């Protein structure tokens, strides 16, 4: 993210979230969670069709 300098391998800059939903998520953590959710949704969308074709 632009908020992190080059060569930043710390967990906060590598998708790690250290705050639960109760306390909340920082904007970087929120963006990482959104990316994970998008990946999951795309995976489900492709895999449902693949499984249906395999079943057919």
């Amino acid at each position: 993210l632009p908020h992190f300098s080059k060569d930043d391998y710390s967990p906060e800059s590598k998708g790690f979230v250290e705050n639960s939903y109760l306390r909340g998520l920082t904007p970087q953590e929120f963006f990482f969670h959104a990316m994970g959710g998008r990946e999951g949704l795309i995976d489900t969308a492709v895999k449902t069709a693949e499984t249906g074709y395999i079943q057919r």
């Binding site: 993210l1 632009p2 929120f30 963006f31 959104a34 990316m35 959710g37 998008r38 990946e39 949704l41 795309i42 995976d43 969308a45 492709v46 069709a49 693949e50």
Partner: peptide, 25 residues
């Protein structure tokens, strides 16, 4: 069924809504 283009890149920060997107194809 190519997931890479569908996934939102890190560049979308501040330009495209991370959450708002249709569900499906």
């Amino acid at each position: 069924k190519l997931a890479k283009p569908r996934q939102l890149h890190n560049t979308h920060w501040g330009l495209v809504c991370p959450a708002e997107t249709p569900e499906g194809q």
